[PDB]
Amino acid sequence: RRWFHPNITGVEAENLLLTRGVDGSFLARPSKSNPGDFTLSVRRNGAVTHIKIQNTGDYYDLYGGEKFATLAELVQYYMEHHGQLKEKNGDVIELKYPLNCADPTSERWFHGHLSGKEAEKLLTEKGKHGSFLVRESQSHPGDFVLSVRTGDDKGESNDGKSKVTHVMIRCQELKYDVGGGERFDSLTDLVEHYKKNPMVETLGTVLQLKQPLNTTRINAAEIESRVRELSKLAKQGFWEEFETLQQQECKLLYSRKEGQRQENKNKNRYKNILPFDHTRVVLHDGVSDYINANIIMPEFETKSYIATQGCLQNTVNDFWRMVFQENSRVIVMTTKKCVKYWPDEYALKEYGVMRVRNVKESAAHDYTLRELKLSKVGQGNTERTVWQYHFRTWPDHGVPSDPGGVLDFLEEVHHKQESIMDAGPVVVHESAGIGRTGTFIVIDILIDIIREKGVDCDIDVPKTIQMVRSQRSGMVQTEAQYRFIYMAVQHYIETLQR
């Protein structure tokens, strides 16, 4: 995600595009004037056009234009649909040349000010073979040091099989080098070069750069201290941790061809917010196999969920086909177009081949529970109860002021799910199925870890979000939702400690 400049003004962006760019050069940056917003700056006809992009709780909104799940999917869309981006007057804005950012402060491997001893401590405790970081030098101001661990062990050791090597990086006229050879435009360029071609020591050791040092995993028992640091005002804040996570989104541009098919286009609440092909729910009840929904598996590729959009008039029947096929017994939803897909209390309705009875509704302060009976018409023996949890106290703007409501809600949802043997994935849906949906699911994943293992366990919020985002685009949308996840997990741990 080199075209994203985290710490530049609009004036700086214009000057950068006018001096180092040409017509078609572009970059993105966070809005300094409206928290959360972003600006896409594009050079056209020797001038710079600015395009406002709102990151709401539900999606990214190119103002006056279309919705997207992430900034990276937005840029990818227009980099491959040249001529689809136009002003209201109709004039085209072409995205041709990403203007690369040199700033490394948002990269997972960049630690800024850090002593050589501390770096060795961190790499010793948390590192394994190929763990690395880049730190400012204290012995050569302005220079940097790449510290990398190599060996066969993992963690603290005394067999000498593992070591930390410190590679000095000179900064000479805004260019970076390791003392010879190529001079790189940025630390990121240097780092990417040695990821592909690791440096070999004179005696043969290959300094493989396999993964950045993890700095975000914490012990759940120490959640308060991390939160207090992230909450400070004057930097290792929620903003910085979230920005670093966002910087990884170009690794999540998985294919979404099925959702792009013409016969499926009108089954999407937003035409550009689509399910990844490799995790989408495939309907095989035959027809049409498509629904805009993804399976979300915890510990993906190392309880499950279906993350999906609110139903459309023309997808209500598909929604119930999915619920039936997947043996889902619990639905989590919010409401704020997406259509009502259940009958009123005591009524029975058919949705295509599926029949649904609303047996009983129960009102709580934070949510309404609907006990639904689902069956396939002509086959009364297929009946099963689907418990629909309609969360009611999520504010129209931002996140709940106290996570207690969500937590008690998810606790009840968890117990309902756990009481039904062999129940399928919990279905979570609202709006586009990524914002609140991802927030609910990530909270539930993290809480479930603490359920099994207790307060003395490791949790990693951004790594968990990245893992969920590899299964559906843009899960967890905003820094407010990110902070809310931490607040919810903190509240949950404190509840258990007391």
Residue numbers in the entry: 4 to 237, 244 to 295, 301 to 316, 325 to 358, 366 to 527
Study text:
The full-length, wild-type SHP2 (FL-WT) contains three domains: a protein tyrosine phosphatase domain (PTP) and two preceding Src homology 2 domains (N-SH2 and C-SH2). The binding of a phosphotyrosine peptide to the opposing face of the N-SH2 domain exposes the catalytic cleft to substrate and activates the system. In diseases caused by SHP2, mutations are often observed at the N-SH2/PTP interface (e.g., E76D/E76K), resulting in constitutively active protein and abnormal cellular proliferation. The recently developed inhibitor, SHP099, allosterically closes the protein and deactivates SHP2 by stabilizing the N-SH2/PTP interaction.
To further substantiate the conformational selection binding mechanism, we investigated SHP099 binding to two additional SHP2 mutants that were originally designed as catalytically dead mutants, with the active site C459 changed to either Ser30 or Glu31. Against our expectations, FL-C459S was found to be predominantly in an open conformation, with chemical shifts comparable to FL-E76K. If a negative charge is indeed crucial for the closed form, the C459E mutant would more properly mimic FL-WT. In agreement with our expectation, FL-C459E is indeed primarily closed as shown by NMR and crystallography making C459E a superior “dead mutant” that better resembles the closed conformation of wild-type SHP2. Strikingly, SHP099 affinities to all FL-SHP2 forms correlate well to the corresponding equilibria between open and closed states: FL-WT, -E76D, and -C495E are predominantly in the closed conformation with tight affinities for SHP099; FL-E76K and -C459S with predominantly open conformations have much weaker affinities.
